[PDB]
Design a binder for this molecule. Sequence first.
Ligand code: CLA
Ligand code: CLA
Ligand code: CLA
Ligand code: CLA
Ligand code: CLA
Ligand code: CLA
Ligand code: CLA
Ligand SMILES: CC1=C(/C=C/C(C)=C/C=C/C(C)=C/C=C/C=C(C)/C=C/C=C(C)/C=C/C2=C(C)CCCC2(C)C)C(C)(C)CCC1
Ligand code: SF4
Ligand code: SF4
Lengths: 60, 733, 161, 30, 40, 81, 33, 80, 161
Amino acid sequence: MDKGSKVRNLRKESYWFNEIGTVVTIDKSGIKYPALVRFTKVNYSGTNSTNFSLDELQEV
Amino acid sequence: ATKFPKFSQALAQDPTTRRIWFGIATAHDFETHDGMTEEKLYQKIFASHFGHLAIIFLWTSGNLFHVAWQGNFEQWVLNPLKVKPIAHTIWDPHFGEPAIKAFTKGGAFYPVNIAYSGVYHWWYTIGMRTNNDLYLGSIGLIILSGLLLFAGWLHLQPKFSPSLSWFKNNESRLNHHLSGLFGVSSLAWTGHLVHVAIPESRGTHIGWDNFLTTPPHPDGLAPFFSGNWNVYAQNPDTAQHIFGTSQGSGSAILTFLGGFHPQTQSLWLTDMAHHHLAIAVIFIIAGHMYRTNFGIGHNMKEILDAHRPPGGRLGAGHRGLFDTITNSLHMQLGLALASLGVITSLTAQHMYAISPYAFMAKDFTTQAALYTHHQYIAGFLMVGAFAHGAIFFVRDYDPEANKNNVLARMLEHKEAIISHLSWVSLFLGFHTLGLYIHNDTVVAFGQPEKQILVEPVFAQFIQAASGKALYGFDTLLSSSESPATVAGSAIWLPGWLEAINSEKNDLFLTIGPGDFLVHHAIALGLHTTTLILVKGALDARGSKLMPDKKDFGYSFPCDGPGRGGTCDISAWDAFYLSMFWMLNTIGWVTFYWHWKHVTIWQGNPAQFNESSNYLMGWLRDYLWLNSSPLINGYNPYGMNSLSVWAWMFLFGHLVWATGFMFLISWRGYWQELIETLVWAHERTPLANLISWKDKPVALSIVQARLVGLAHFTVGYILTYAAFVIASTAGKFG
Amino acid sequence: ETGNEPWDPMGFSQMYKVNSLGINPHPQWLQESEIKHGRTAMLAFVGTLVIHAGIHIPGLDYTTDWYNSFPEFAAKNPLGLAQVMAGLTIWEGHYGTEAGLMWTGEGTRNPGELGFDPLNLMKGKSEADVNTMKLKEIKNGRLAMIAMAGFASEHFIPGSV
Amino acid sequence: MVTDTQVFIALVLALISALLAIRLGTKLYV
Amino acid sequence: ENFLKYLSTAPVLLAAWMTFTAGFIIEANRFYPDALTFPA
Amino acid sequence: TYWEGKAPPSKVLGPVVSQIPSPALGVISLICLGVGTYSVHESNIFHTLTADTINPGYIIGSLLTPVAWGTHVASWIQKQN
Amino acid sequence: ASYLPSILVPLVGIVFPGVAMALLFLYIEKDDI
Amino acid sequence: SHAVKIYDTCIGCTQCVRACPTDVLEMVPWDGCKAGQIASAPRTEDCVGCKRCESACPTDFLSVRVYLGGETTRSMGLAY
Amino acid sequence: DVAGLIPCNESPVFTKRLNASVVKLENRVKKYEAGSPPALALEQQIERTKQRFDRYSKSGLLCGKDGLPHLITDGRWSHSIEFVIPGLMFLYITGWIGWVGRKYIRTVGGDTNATEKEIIIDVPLALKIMSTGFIWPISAWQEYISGTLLADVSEITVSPR
Ligand code: CLA
Ligand code: CLA
Ligand code: CLA
Ligand code: CLA
Ligand code: CLA
Ligand code: CLA
Ligand code: CLA
Ligand SMILES: CC1=C(/C=C/C(C)=C/C=C/C(C)=C/C=C/C=C(C)/C=C/C=C(C)/C=C/C2=C(C)CCCC2(C)C)C(C)(C)CCC1
Ligand code: SF4
Ligand code: SF4
């Protein structure tokens, strides 16, 4: 929704499913997955951020 | 077409030796065959089942023929306690003269194997007495197998192939396979027992030539129709009855004596006849439950849809299970395998305790062999049931058709199931191993009085409840002033109590701390194997590591070293891992049974009660002590009849070790070695003429794990079979 | 009066907040159970007090000392036991549906309110008709439960008076 | 005590069954 | 500061605490040995 | 026949039972339970069962108890509506 | 009887497996049908 | 040959293409991503199935996926 | 009594085991001079063995046909000393441990360096938490009824849930 806002993940395949992550950047220039989110826990690959579509995030 | 495996174009185009190997391992997976439809799948399964029945009946006919032609069945039935039953002759040109002289036993005049199948006792009990009867049975079975093979061929013709709707006619199949396959079959078997087995046991020869004129009972169906069925229970065989002769014989054909026949130490034939009559009646009544184009009956889809508790704790209840079960062959295959495994375990548990066959329970080797055999088969069947359930989840489950279903809710809270199973497994393992090591340590320091010996109060209480007047509990049938004993006092309580309280039996063996610890070890084994299999089945459709696992199928090697490494991540790998635990737990069970029975047979059961509380006791008093007659099958001084079993013992050890070769060392090393081997072959004169047609490559990862597991299992089974047979037959205990 | 406020040390009432998919009883179920126990305890107090020192009902034998009474009751008067059990079963069956709904908050019937008013009482107006006497019933029932526990404990150890 | 005639007829019936097995397998049709 | 912080590391603290637990268990078994069951 | 709510549709009881009013099923269930319990008690509880004490009537009555349970469930289903 | 094993065991353990493996080897690498 | 699929979650960082040892993957112009590029697998006949591309993927779950299938001389990593 | 077990006080096999242990120790000590350190050690071992056997005889354990004590663990209060009493202690101790651990996890978890505080323990805070475990049951129950013990369904899971 906005920079720095916490969002609950809804991507079923995501390692951070049902977890809270902070939005880093949002691309207003179209794009299918514009909302970059960062989570505290690192996934199995060691990364802690991913791009999601606004439909795949619960706002708060 | 175009190569060996038609059913796989991808494998057909494979230029390596892999094409051959997988061509063997994908043959019976009809679902994956190219150009395969549901109807052809069902018809091919039907024909294959016909072929398998033919194989079973030919195996049985072979057993009968070999016993008749080379056995000593007549000599055995004459004196069934002292002579040893014969399996078949040994025509081995590799034998030396001392071997021929050593393996000549029983009837003699040729080398021979002593049968440990117990088929002699079974055939004697069911009324057979002469080699002619065995031969006639074998000829009948050969004809039956030929008939089944012809039927299998016939039901593949275009005009005789049953339609797809026919296979999925669940109601009629259940009706006929309940009332007909189970009930009418049981009715026929009790008819045999009344007409043949019982008269043969009472010294009267009934055969095809005279069974139509000698009624099994002197009154002859007059009491049956008149309602005076009590007539058939009057005048049973008195305790002073010599089995197979009219000495002390009776006339009853349907009684409820209970207990055991004193002379044979087995069940009364009349009791078996009454049992099977009642079972046949119950099954025949049960088979009229479902409707088959006759108006009356139940429709199972409605039953399943209707059972959804209004409390909502089961969600949508059983809605949609009918479609999943009927449309999925893997789910019903798993259900059948599980039920068969439970029944195989039940047969193993009940034959030893409740001897059904005359003069068995004195042929110790046969009893041990049968128990171990059926327990191992039960373990295999259970593992297969869970494996096919995982397969069903992989390729037959439809999450949209099972929304909020009971089965879907199984996956919804899979984490809880797996975590609590893991907790139970850890709890049992930690504490059982801790108690065993505590006993080992205290006994090691010469302080056996410090052992934690826990009395199995609950099992002993159950034994007392059945009438075991040894623990002084005074509960239920063990106390005279109880409704249960008085109500049952008239019918079967006297014989059952006489059998249970007699210590010359396997009915409710006395138990102590050793039995307690071993039972908790068995619980650990069952829980851990179930944990592995259930985790495989539930995570078959995906995990956090592989959220799209279902897309890779049931059996795939891995998903690469990425994101931490994913070796043995598929459900097939869960089955492969669980096979080791199944073997380990079945081994524990069989070790427990064999050691307890060996100590009882030797006449010093105290040895087990003393030495089963610490592991060194198991290693010394059971494995080290009872293997002496086995490893001495052949020594530099000479050889004896057990030499074959010692050789098989070493062979099983070798195969078991060879399995580690495939289980530890993985493919890359072997592929890099085969590279050099290929180079060497290609660069050799006089051998460049001969060139492989299939490119030689190392075994695939999944294939290698399977082959290692197969070697492990074969070696395990062969070595333990050799041990259990040889020790028992060498020390007669 | 424990402060005239809900006395729930160990907080057994509040666990309905955690849904737990209906595992934990709703307050209505606990309330109905408490009233049932209180009524049973008071009637049992009458029974203990009289039977312990009593001539006993005229009938077959019927010599008992309140601790061995039930076996003698079953042996001497089987028909009586049969009709007692049948009547209690019928009463419990008539209700129970509402009790089953009372495990959750779906009872639809006020806890402890059964169709038993042999003498009509609509005089009360405060809250539930004479809510104060409902409190009186629950209070004397709690005390009766205390009394049954006291007799049962005095059985083994002479606990008090 | 099975005579040679009995063994021979058993072998004949086994041969018939074997031929039927051959045909059934062939009909399963790889 | 640094030395004490090092002493606060997981392995050092685990070793120290397990040594302490083993020590008091050993002493308890030394003063009340062969304690299969609780005194009345 | 999948049903939600608190009471299943009458069609679950089958073509015949589904048409029976609740009081009839209740009385039938009470009669069946009484007969079955009485039969089960007369033989093997109040009297020991022997070879020559097998009464077909008592066997039928004993079998009638599950019929009593089914009829009481059906009566409740009919009662809810 | 007492002569058959000599005739058959060699056939079942040598001749039969030999011919069976020969035919299977021919068919596996036939390269057509 | 193995089947290599690229999903629209890709962020076009090129890492999968770089990691590929058999030059199966490549970059093609795209508009659904910020970088304007997406991975493609035009020539999967040369894919060996090492799954290096998946290992070298930033996206939560493997915008590039490899599914092993029929094996040929090329995909079997055989110099013979 | 229980399952055909005779109390170890009157167990001939128990006394035979005691005699065997003592006599074997005496045979071992017969090869040392009186007063030698080995002799004193063996005499102390003999005394400890006698005390152990006397304590077992006086405790009330049940012997088997083998003469060794057996444990009854069906809940029998007369034999609680064997399993129930120690078990409770265990469930207390471990409980304490567990509770304390959880608290630490939930105390340092609200920091940026939460990981760095697990390899390196905050010994002052760690001891602060550890000293509070003696009331772990009460605190656990209070958290349970207060909803602060369990996380909501909104937590990590897998594709099929
Ligand atoms: C009365 C009619 C009848 C009968 C006798 C059968 C019988 C059979 N059917 Mg058929 N079937 C029927 C009606 C019938 N069916 C109808 C109406 C349909 C249409 C829906 C089908 C459709 C159908 C299909 C599609 C298939 C069969 C199959 C089978 C076979 C199952 C495998 C087997 O050997 O059974 C096992 C028989 C037993 C008696 C074992 C009972 C199991 C218990 C657990 C064993 C316990 C026994 C005992 C205690 C152990 C001691 C014995 C020991 C001493 C030897 C069996 C021959 C299958 C098959 O193999 O085809 C050839 C198959 O694929 N049936
Ligand atoms: C009647 C029951 C039954 C039926 C119809 C099937 C049928 C099937 N199973 Mg199931 N299965 C069963 C029982 C059954 N299985 C049991 C009991 C287990 C537990 C062990 C399993 C475990 C299992 C697994 C784990 C898998 C299957 C699979 C399959 C499918 C392919 C099988 C195949 O290609 O065979 C190929 C046949 C072979 C490779 C032959 C191997 C024979 C053994 C291992 C070697 C024996 C060596 C011998 C004893 C050595 C001699 C000793 C001497 C040297 C001394 C097929 C639909 C597979 C699948 O994907 O299905 C979709 C699969 O992954 N099954
Ligand atoms: C003797 C061999 C052995 C042993 C002891 C175990 C033990 C275990 N296995 Mg393994 N396993 C083995 C062989 C063995 N396995 C083999 C050959 C296979 C086939 C590949 C498997 C496959 C397998 C799978 C697939 C699974 C297990 C599981 C388990 C657990 C079962 C529950 C249990 O007992 O918890 C109690 C734990 C033990 C008995 C382990 C020993 C613990 C000791 C006593 C503690 C010692 C602490 C001590 C201070 C160490 C100090 C070290 C220091 C000196 C350096 C446990 C960890 C299951 C599991 O994880 O359950 C949660 C599971 O899912 N195992
Ligand atoms: C599981 C068996 C079962 C089921 C599903 C029912 C269901 C029903 N009964 Mg029946 N009932 C039962 C057993 C059962 N009863 C027994 C044993 C008796 C005593 C003989 C009665 C006596 C009875 C009467 C007198 C009446 C009902 C009535 C009713 C209906 C509404 C009241 C109600 O459910 O709560 C009533 C609650 C109970 C009776 C408590 C039963 C608790 C049982 C004993 C617990 C056992 C279940 C257990 C969890 C199963 C575990 C199995 C596992 C170990 C394998 C409802 C259809 C009423 C009705 O039909 O009105 C129209 C009615 O008036 N029931
Ligand atoms: C219960 C056992 C059993 C059954 C019923 C089947 C059934 C089937 N298999 Mg499977 N299979 C089995 C065991 C079994 N298989 C085993 C153990 C293996 C090895 C792991 C395989 C490996 C395998 C492969 C690789 C393939 C099959 C195929 C088939 C199908 C038809 C094959 C056929 O008969 O063609 C015709 C074959 C024959 C007519 C030969 C019959 C053999 C005769 C009777 C031998 C008689 C010789 C006699 C003993 C000689 C004695 C002489 C003496 C005097 C010296 C059918 C579905 C094929 C299939 O359908 O795949 C979809 C296929 O491709 N199977
Ligand atoms: C599955 C059942 C079975 C088994 C395991 C055996 C096993 C044996 N038989 Mg026997 N046999 C059987 C059935 C069986 N027989 C039947 C039904 C007959 C009646 C024809 C005979 C008649 C017979 C004779 C006359 C002789 C043997 C002999 C032998 C031994 C050497 C093998 C040999 O030369 O075969 C010879 C067997 C045949 C030529 C007929 C084939 C046997 C069965 C019917 C084949 C079953 C195939 C099975 C279903 C699996 C097929 C798959 C396979 C191709 C991989 C061996 C112990 C010999 C012996 O005693 O040596 C000491 C011997 O001389 N058998
Ligand atoms: C304080 C930390 C803590 C807590 C509260 C729990 C609590 C629990 N664990 Mg976990 N666990 C822990 C640490 C912890 N565990 C560690 C360190 C390991 C790795 C060895 C595990 C491995 C583990 C497995 C594999 C399983 C559990 C399970 C369980 C549950 C049942 C109890 C049990 O089996 O314990 C088992 C405990 C162990 C096997 C090892 C515990 C080792 C020590 C004693 C704990 C750490 C103490 C630590 C020093 C804290 C210091 C605090 C200080 C700094 C102030 C329960 C939810 C089971 C479950 O899921 O049940 C549903 C289960 O299957 N645990
Ligand atoms: C994977 C899977 C699967 C499978 C599963 C399984 C395999 C299961 C198993 C299960 C089992 C394996 C179970 C078992 C059971 C058992 C039982 C259930 C028993 C019971 C018993 C009882 C209940 C009782 C008895 C008795 C009586 C009668 C009374 C008294 C006591 C006695 C004991 C005597 C399927 C396919 C589905 C699909 C999905 C997934
Ligand atoms: S590595 Fe992944 S994110 Fe990067 S270009 Fe390749 S597919 Fe896209
Ligand atoms: S699996 Fe290996 S060869 Fe195939 S596309 Fe990925 S990196 Fe390239």
